[PDB]
Design a protein around this ligand. Structure first.
Ligand SMILES: Nc1nc2c(ncn2[C@@H]2O[C@H](COP(=O)(O)OP(=O)(O)NP(=O)(O)O)[C@@H](O)[C@H]2O)c(=O)[nH]1
Ligand SMILES: *[C@H](Cc1nnco1)n1cnc(-c2cc(C(F)(F)F)cc(C(F)(F)F)c2)n1
Ligand SMILES: [Cl-]
Ligand SMILES: [Cl-]
Ligand SMILES: [Cl-]
Ligand SMILES: [Cl-]
Ligand SMILES: [Cl-]
Ligand SMILES: [Mg+2]
Lengths: 208, 1017, 123
């Protein structure tokens, strides 16, 4: 069984980057605006079995809004995203929330303040209070540093499965195969490798 | 594929096909879902798509199709309604109304298609915003009448009224003009007497139905704006606080209403009202105690179990209790008969405060802060809450979060390791907890000591020993520093340290010792007052920290270094004087052993150590002694430096060595560290290395360029080149750090600046883009900031070397070279502030690039760039104005005035720069006011473009009307003329001016906006 | 879980990247503990690496005798190599991997252990 999760929030807040990090492990530095919605299945392994989210990552730019609240129909949960380095994005949280709960009247929702890795934070900790009267969970997160990146999904999983002690668990690790490289491909591997060697790894000043 | 058929409007709409596409989208997956999504968006976006709405609503078997049909109508109603022929408006109203009536009368549809009904209701509300009451005066009377005919209709009417109240009062500010918002609010206000009558009647004649819940939901909204008499002069408080608290279906919403009631604007001198305010609270607490849980109940356990809606209920109770009591607890404090109510309410909060849920804890902690702050000031109040405060001490002490300073944490394997990253999201929490605990300690310092000291004893005896317990306690003890008397502090800290030393002896193994080490370090660092009074113990502390700098546990080591500097920041005077019974100031002892002390530390830890020594050395105000100390401190790096300079100068080969590049980098970093804490006092050390340092900057620069030549741009990624550039960056950082704190600016100009510029400018100018360091721009900003006024030719030289080449890096997109971008506009800003003459000497072509550069800046979304972009523009206009009537000013306005007006309007109106609205408005106001005040001497028009002697005001309006007409061709001429009339009039009142701009931004989003809206006052 | 039948020969913190040849860029695949595991029944040594917090597998492959660790041009603390059969995402698949460590010492220790594991697998 799987749950529909809608992800909403202003353009540039890091919605798609957040999801990608969870799908592939990657951090995408480019801002390519989402067009309407992109749907991605996302599975987590837990002590209560596997939980699957069908993530509806929606567009935050009005010009690219597509079906808008039409995306929210039959959502079973949601994440509302803002950017702690842009105050206008927090100011718009009540607008997103409004449009969301008009369609989805009783669903668990996490509010996420993204980009906490950035030094000059604009939306102070103390200012973030919108979630209280609306019963939203709140987390400071960073898709870039992975700070709290698992928290929104762990909470939603707990609320949807209805078990507060649910935890992520290590997925089983099957014995991997023994393959010998194809004699016919060894010339090409040499080439593909050399391009990889001579492309610099990103963020060489990071701790890892 | 077949699905694209719905996009051909030359044919009739195949509803079956539509439903298949929608279903493929909502219930499908993969490529098919994606294709379906694109099709639907194109369908939705077809501007005649609304014409199919009725057909869809009539024939579809898919509620999502109908939902989408209604989204198409909403878009039309919100944006193009007044474009429509009148009969299409009547038709649309009629079938939205009919569909709602229809769906409410079929019980099955009403039961199972709530999403569609809700959507239809909202769509209706959009029509009301356009049409009501002026062209629909009977809407409320008829809604009220229809409500009696059917339970379903009555319920749905409540949803409609809720949505209307939201759209009119809660969400109108950004979506409507000021005039239209006033019109609708007044209209709702005028008919609310009857709306309320229905509401109240429904609530009297029902218990816990969906009609009741719907009615209460609407009431929550009304409470945002209705006059208090509707609440206090009817029986409604009794109903909310008794009847509706008893059933759980109504309890959730009622409690939220009561919270909002507690925020109503209410007369303060009326005993009747006061009694009413007391009574509903009394009633409410009584219902909780008898229908939900008693005051003794374990709310921590209940929240954790997370049954049904319990978590949200507990949250909402916390919100209710904190909101009410912060406002009204004084109502309960003097009358003996109300004392039990006051305390029980607070006992519930004490129980709520034990819940494990950070965000809820913050909500309760905010209340406690409000309470204890009041008890700290207000006569005769604190005794009332003595027992509550005593329980609160325990809760806070037991839920202390890890301070910033404590760098060890327990991993998933039960090992005590250094943290991977900062716990940035608990910084505010720690501060909040400390604030409350400090107040609580002041309120009863005996109770606080007793609690801490006995909790500590149960750690030593073993009964309550754990890492969690020793930690929270230790953090709590450190956090209350400042609250006790020196005497009591003395005895207290002494007892605490003894007990923690005992734990350290008794608890063996690496994990235990790390925990306890971290805890003692935190505590002792928190009590400098004690250290200052107790030299022998201070000396012992510092020596132990030095021992910890040799620890293989990296958390402990790192914290030893932070704790050393934290203590030094507060106790440095005791290191610089010679203490009784010592043969030398302790700073001398530290410097002598620096090699041994720091031998096992990582470089950045060594630099921190050296920085700490600089703090102390700067306490010595005899210059000879200070310089001597400085000299001694820098002995190791200066000897390393001297040997490196002799090698380098003999032959640029040895510097290729990566081991040498690292050594150099760490010498400069050590200098930076000491400069940071010594500031102006660092100059003699800077002078010892300055000339050789700038020569090194040149030699390394040549190597970088050579390597890029031999290897390509990819060289800039290599460890060698990154290492070489680190040297350059640290050198730039050292000079910046020094100049930013310098007090002798004559020496800066006479000794430092010419060789700096000579070494850095041309090198920047003549490297390829990827090899230019943005730190050069950063260094120059500080140079200009501090001495720009003294070096006008120097400033000119800076512009010549960096302006055009940096602009050409950053003017192809908004993302490449992000640091250069940010530092570029900071430099232009300070040059424009301090050395405007530099821009006057530019050749006209280059000055044009400057204007282009500024306008480019405000098209960024990056706030760093945008903000400076707008400030530069503002400052430039001021600088030009300051010159007065001279040829440069006149040519500036002739060439650039309208470019600044148009570019500012562009970012104001494009929806992609909303973050800069305030400063955009300020600039626009400045620009318009220049003409309004006749501060522009020459005509802004040219030749016979317009009649001779035509005033610049008339031409400005003409220009703007024409600009807006072409840019927003859907506006009427009258909307445009009215807008500019209002705007130009208001060019001396920023708040009003901004409101007029915001009204304009609303009107450009639709057709038919009322031009009289701009008369709002 | 499927790791009780194995001995941990070496563990180190690392960041794993995979090369997207189309985009011509390295993309992170995961950060966490990279482990060298020897099956007690087959004596075959594998790399198994899981992401912090989610514990999802970001590498699962035999340390084949034919693999060779190569420097990356940008780093003195990383290795790049070609893997013909990784099952982290399930179906066996070929990748060019880069793995980076906190220090050069760590990177050098990895290589030493990697090559040891290769000789074990050769047996
Ligand atoms: N510093 C930092 N940058 C981040 C973080 N998360 C995302 N970004 C950056 O922010 C930019 C926008 O990210 P993106 O995921 O496209 O945002 P979005 O909310 O999906 N935009 P849209 O609603 O238009 O599809 C990207 O350049 C991305 O790299 C973060 O945690 N820290
Ligand atoms: C326990 C922690 C520990 N880790 N490794 C070895 O011990 N322990 C034992 N002594 C101390 C300690 C003593 C002092 C003294 F003696 F000066 F008071 C000071 C400190 C501190 F942290 F430097 F203040 C610690 N800790
Ligand atoms: Cl901001
Ligand atoms: Cl629907
Ligand atoms: Cl009344
Ligand atoms: Cl002092
Ligand atoms: Cl007109
Ligand atoms: Mg996106």
């Amino acid at each position: 069984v799987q749950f529909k999760l809608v992800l909403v929030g202003d353009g540039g807040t890091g919605k798609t980057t957040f999801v990608k990090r969870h799908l592939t492990g990657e951090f995408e530095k480019k801002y390519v605006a989402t067009l309407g919605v992109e749907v991605h299945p996302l599975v987590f392994h837990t002590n209560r079995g596997p939980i699957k989210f069908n993530v509806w990552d929606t567009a935050g730019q009005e010009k690219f809004g597509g079906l808008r609240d039409g995306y929210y129909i039959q959502a079973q949960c949601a994440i509302i995203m803002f950017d702690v380095t842009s105050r206008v994005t927090y100011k718009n949280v009540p607008n997103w929330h409004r449009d969301l709960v008009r369609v989805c009247e009783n669903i668990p929702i996490v509010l996420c303040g993204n980009k906490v890795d950035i030094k000059d934070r604009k939306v102070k900790a103390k200012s973030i209070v919108f979630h209280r009267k609306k019963n939203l969970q709140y987390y400071d997160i960073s898709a870039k540093s992975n700070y709290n990146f698992e928290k929104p999904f762990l909470w939603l999983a707990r609320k949807l499965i209805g078990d507060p002690n649910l935890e992520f668990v290590a997925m089983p690790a099957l014995a991997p195969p023994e393959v010998v490289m194809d004699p016919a491909l060894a010339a090409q591997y040499e080439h593909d490798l050399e391009v990889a060697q001579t492309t610099a790894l990103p963020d060489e000043d990071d701790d890892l | 594929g077949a699905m694209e058929g719905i996009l051909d409007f030359s044919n009739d709409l195949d509803i079956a096909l539509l439903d298949q596409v929608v279903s493929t989208f909502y219930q499908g997956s993969g490529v098919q879902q994606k294709q379906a999504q694109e099709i639907l968006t194109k369908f939705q976006d077809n501007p005649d798509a609304w014409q199919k709405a009725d057909q869809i609503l009539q024939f579809s078997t898919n509620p999502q199709s109908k939902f989408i049909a209604l989204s198409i109508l909403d878009k039309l109603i919100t944006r193009k309604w007044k474009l429509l022929p009148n009969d299409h408006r009547i038709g649309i109203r009629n079938f939205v109304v009919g569909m709602i009536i229809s769906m409410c009368q079929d019980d099955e549809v009403f039961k199972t298609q709530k999403n569609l009904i809700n959507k239809s209701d909202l769509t209706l509300v959009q029509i009301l915003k356009q049409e009501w009451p002026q062209n629909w005066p009977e809407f409320i009377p008829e809604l009220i009448g229809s409500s009696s005919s059917s339970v379903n209709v009555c319920e749905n009417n409540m949803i409609v009224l809720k949505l209307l109240s939201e759209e009119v009062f809660d969400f109108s500010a950004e979506q409507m003009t000021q005039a239209k918002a006033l019109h609708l609010k007044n209209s709702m206000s005028k008919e609310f007497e009857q709306i309320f009558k229905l509401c109240f009647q429904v609530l009297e004649q029902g218990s816990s139905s969906s009609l009741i819940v719907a009615t209460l939901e609407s009431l929550l909204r009304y409470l945002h704006w209705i006059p208090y008499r509707y609440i206090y002069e009817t029986n409604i408080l009794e109903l909310l606080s008794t009847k509706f608290m008893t059933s759980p279906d109504t309890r959730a919403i009622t409690l939220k209403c009561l919270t909002e009631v507690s925020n109503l604007k209410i007369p303060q001198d009326n005993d009747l009202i006061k009694r009413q305010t007391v009574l509903f609270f009394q009633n409410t607490l009584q219902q909780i105690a008898t229908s939900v849980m008693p005051v003794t109940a374990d709310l921590k356990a209940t929240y954790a179990n997370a049954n049904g809606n319990d978590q949200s209920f507990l949250q909402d109770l916390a919100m209710f209790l904190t909101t009410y009591l912060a406002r009204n607890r004084a109502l309960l404090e003097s009358d003996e008969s109300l004392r039990e109510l006051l305390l029980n309410a607070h006992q519930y909060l004490i129980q709520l405060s034990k819940i494990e849920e950070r965000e809820l804890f913050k909500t309760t902690l905010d209340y406690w802060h409000n309470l204890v702050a009041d008890l700290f000031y207000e006569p005769l109040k604190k005794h009332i809450y003595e027992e509550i405060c005593s329980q609160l001490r325990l809760v806070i002490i037991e839920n202390m979060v890890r301070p910033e300073e404590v760098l060890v944490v327990e991993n998933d394997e039960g090992e005590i390791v250094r943290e991977f990253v900062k716990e940035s999201d608990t910084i505010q929490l720690y501060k909040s907890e400390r604030e409350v605990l400090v107040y609580l300690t002041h309120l009863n310092v005996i109770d606080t000591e007793e609690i801490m000291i006995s909790k500590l004893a149960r750690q030593i005896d073993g009964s309550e020993w754990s890492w969690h317990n020793i930690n929270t306690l230790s953090w709590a003890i450190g956090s209350i520093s400042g609250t006790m008397s020196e005497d009591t502090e003395k005895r207290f800290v002494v007892t605490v340290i003894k007990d923690l030393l005992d734990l350290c002896v008794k608890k063996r193994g690496k994990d235990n010792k790390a925990v306890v080490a971290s805890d003692i370090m935190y505590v002792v660092g928190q009590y400098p007052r004690f250290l200052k009074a107790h030299w022998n113990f201070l000396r012992t502390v510092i020596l132990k920290l030095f021992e910890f700098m040799h620890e293989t546990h990296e958390g402990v080591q790192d914290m030893a270094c932070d704790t050393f500097i934290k203590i030094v920041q507060k106790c440095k005077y005791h290191f610089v004087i010679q203490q009784p019974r010592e043969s030398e100031p302790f700073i001398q002892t530290i410097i002598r052993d620096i090699q041994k002390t720091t031998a096992d530390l990582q470089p950045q830890q060594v630099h921190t150590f050296y920085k700490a020594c600089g703090i102390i050395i700067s306490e010595e105000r005899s210059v000879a002694e200070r310089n001597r100390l400085l000299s001694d401190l820098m002995q190791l790096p200066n000897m390393a430096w001297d040997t490196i300079v002799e090698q380098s100068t003999a032959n640029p080969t040895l510097l290729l060595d990566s081991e040498t590049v690292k050594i150099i980098a760490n010498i400069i970093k050590t200098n930076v560290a000491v400069c940071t804490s010594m500031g102006a006092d660092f100059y003699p050390q800077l002078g010892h290395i300055y000339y050789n340092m700038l020569q090194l900057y040149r030699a390394v620069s040549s190597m970088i360029s050579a390597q890029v030549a031999a290897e390509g741009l990819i060289a800039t990624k290599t460890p060698k080149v990154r290492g070489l550039r680190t040297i350059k960056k640290e050198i730039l950082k050292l000079v910046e750090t020094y100049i930013s704190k310098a007090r002798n600016l004559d020496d800066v100009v006479k000794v430092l600046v010419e060789p700096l510029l000579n070494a850095v400018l041309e090198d920047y100018m003549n490297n390829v883009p990827d090899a230019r360091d943005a730190e050069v721009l950063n260094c120059m900003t500080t140079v200009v900031e501090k001495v720009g006024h003294m070096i006008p030719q120097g400033v000119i030289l800076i512009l010549q070397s960096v302006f055009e080449c940096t602009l050409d890096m950053i003017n192809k997109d908004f993302t490449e070279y992000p640091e250069h971008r940010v530092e570029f506009y900071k430099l232009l800003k300070v040059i424009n502030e301090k050395s405007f003459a530099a821009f006057l000497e530019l050749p006209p072509a280059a000055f044009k690039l400057f204007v282009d550069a500024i306008c480019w800046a405000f098209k960024h979304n990056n706030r760093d760039v945008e903000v400076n972009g707008l400030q530069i523009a503002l400052d430039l206009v001021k600088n030009i104005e300051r010159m007065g009537n001279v040829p440069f000013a006149n040519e500036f306005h002739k060439n650039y005035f309208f470019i600044f007006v148009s570019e500012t309007f562009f970012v104001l109106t494009d929806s992609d720069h909303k973050s800069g609205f305030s400063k955009q408005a300020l600039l626009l106001m400045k620009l318009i006011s220049l003409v309004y005040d006749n501060k522009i001497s020459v005509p802004l028009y040219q030749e016979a473009e317009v009649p001779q002697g035509t005033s610049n005001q008339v031409y400005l309006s003409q220009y703007l009307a024409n600009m807006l007409s072409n840019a927003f061709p859907h506006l009427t001429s009258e909307q445009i003329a009215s807008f500019l009339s209002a705007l130009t009039k208001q060019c001396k009142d920023l708040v009003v001016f901004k409101g007029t701009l915001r009204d304009f931004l609303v009107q450009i989003k639709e057709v038919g906006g009322d031009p009289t809206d701009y008369l709002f006052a | 879980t499927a790791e009780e039948d194995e001995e941990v020969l070496y563990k180190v913190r690392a960041k794993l990247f995979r090369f997207d040849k189309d985009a011509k860029e390295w993309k992170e695949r995961g950060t966490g503990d990279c482990k060298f595991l020897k099956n007690k029944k087959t004596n075959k040594v594998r790399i198994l690496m899981r992401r912090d917090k989610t514990l999802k597998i970001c590498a699962n492959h035999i340390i084949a005798p034919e693999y060779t660790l190569k420097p990356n041009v940008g780093s003195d603390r990383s290795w790049v190599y070609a893997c013909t059969a990784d099952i982290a995402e399930g179906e066996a698949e070929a990748f060019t991997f880069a793995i980076r460590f906190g220090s050069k010492e760590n990177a050098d220790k990895f290589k030493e252990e990697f090559e040891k594991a290769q000789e074990i697998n050769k047996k």
